[model samples]
Target: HHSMAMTQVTILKKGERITWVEVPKGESREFNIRGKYFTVSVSDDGTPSISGSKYTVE
Candidate 1:
């Protein structure tokens, strides 16, 4: 159980999360996993969104 919510980011290795974080609104972060870089962000409305060199979401 939790109170309030932010966009959650997780790094998965072998189907398990190795690292996790909660992203704040209108902010961006970079993560390196297995020598790959990823950028994730959270919308101002708290909607989960992702960007950078990876798969796209609609």
Candidate 2:
């Protein structure tokens, strides 16, 4: 019942650095920086599920 098209998320590193990522509907993406891991997934409704590493998200 929604019309959303895209989902955006911010990844915050331990050193206060920030990384921005975009996930299209029903897709997923992964990132590995400085030996840390980050995983990002988006549902069809633009909801996001993040996992891996000790990184924070916003």
For each candidate, give its TM-score against the true structure.
0.49, 0.57
Cα RMSD to native, each candidate?
4.9, 4.3
For 1-58, candidate 2 gives per-residue lDDT tens digits of: 8786467866776746477788786988887756766678877766666786566655
Q: What local distance difference test score does each model get?
A: 0.60, 0.72
- Report clashes for each candidate as comma-separated counts: 0, 0
Best by lDDT: 2
Give the local distance difference test score of model 1. Answer: 0.60
lDDT of 1 by residue, 1-58 (tens): 8886667766444446576767777787776655777676766775544455343322
RMSD of 1: 4.9
Q: How many backbone clashes does candidate 1 have?
A: 0
Clash pairs detected, candidate 1: none
